[PDB]
């Protein structure tokens, strides 16, 4: 896997914020979540809320029956990553109590000034086999690729900020495994 279009983040001239008099624009930077999973079924999500009283907007699938406990841990908030444009990043994480059939990897770097650091290479393979030499097994002859790559925020001329995202490439080798029942 790698992030596609990393160089696009060098566009420091498109109605950005001058860092200072005659400065170039402030480049895309700040709070970032880079995450990607390979699964024989949907990624399984646990809900966790920064603020349980946050009203997640009509059209997104969010933790229902939020209590103050939702802010730290509340096992009611289970869900399947089964729909796009659906599950907000900021209220769902991989549920570590149940992704036996998925391999997930992610990193949050928080901070308004966090510099983006994106490596690209066609030389780097990641193995998906577990302690027992078994990879994810594709139930229903389906493979489930999940990803988030919030790279940072674009700072407009006014100072107003928009999250900026990038596509993620996947190439998964698969083989056949004999299975009972």
């Amino acid at each position: 896997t790698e992030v596609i279009g990393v160089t696009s983040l060098m566009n420091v001239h498109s109605n950005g914020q001058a860092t200072h008099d005659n400065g170039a624009g402030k480049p895309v930077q700040g709070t970032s979540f880079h995450f990607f999973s390979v699964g024989g079924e949907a990624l399984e999500l646990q809900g966790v809320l920064f603020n349980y009283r946050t009203k997640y907007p009509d059209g997104t699938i969010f933790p229902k029956n939020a209590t103050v406990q939702s802010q730290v841990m509340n096992t009611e908030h289970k869900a399947y990553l089964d729909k796009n444009k659906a599950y907000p990043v900021e209220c769902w994480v991989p549920d570590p109590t149940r992704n036996e059939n998925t391999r997930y990897f992610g990193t949050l770097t928080g901070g308004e000034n966090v510099p983006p650091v994106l490596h690209i290479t066609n030389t780097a393979t990641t193995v998906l086999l577990d302690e027992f030499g078994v990879g994810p097994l594709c139930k229903g002859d389906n493979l489930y690729l999940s990803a988030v790559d919030v790279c940072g925020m674009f700072t407009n001329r006014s100072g107003s900020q928009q999250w900026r995202g990038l596509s993620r490439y996947f190439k998964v080798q698969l083989r056949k495994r004999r299975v009972k029942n």
Partner: antibody
Amino acid sequence: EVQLVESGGGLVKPGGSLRLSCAASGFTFSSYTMNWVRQAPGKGLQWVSSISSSSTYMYYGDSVKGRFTISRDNARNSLYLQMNSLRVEDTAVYYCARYAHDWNVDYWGQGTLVTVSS
Amino acid sequence: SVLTQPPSASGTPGQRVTISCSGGSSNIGSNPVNWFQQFPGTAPKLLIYANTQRPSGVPDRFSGSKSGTSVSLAISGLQSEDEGDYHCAAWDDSLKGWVFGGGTKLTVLG
């Protein structure tokens, strides 16, 4: 500079009709969503209609839903407002305005007067 | 769903005058406010954009503040050349349109 110039405004009787014209020079007109905003004599401002760069999204204030139609010709660098079934309330100066990302509504024309009287 | 600004405001030359614009979550909460200055017999012109920013040509004196669903315009070092109507505007997500305020006629005394 950026210059917007309205025209087509005049006197009509209720139930009348009228087509307004905005002429854009100074910028790639074909790149920007464009607006009509009107100002009834003595009273404040009131947005009429929006149109996207490619005319994919037109929006109208409800005061004119069904009666007015916004359009553009990107080859003729011109924004239009088709005003049908004109009423006395529709009397105003009709300004033409440009929306730009972040800058929001920025540049305005001189306005053109539409008077609707029996 | 409508923007509320004082119908009138006034001050003595050299004073700071403050015109407020109050909206709700559907408009000013999630969308930016531009301020437009309008002299008798003239078009509106951009004075403030994005709540708090000056285009080239607008003095230091003109400033803005945002606190959630309400914004204010601050004319400091008030002058007679500042006599006019001040229009408050912002997109409303519910009405899918631009909402304006009533306008604020600023009188300068002397």
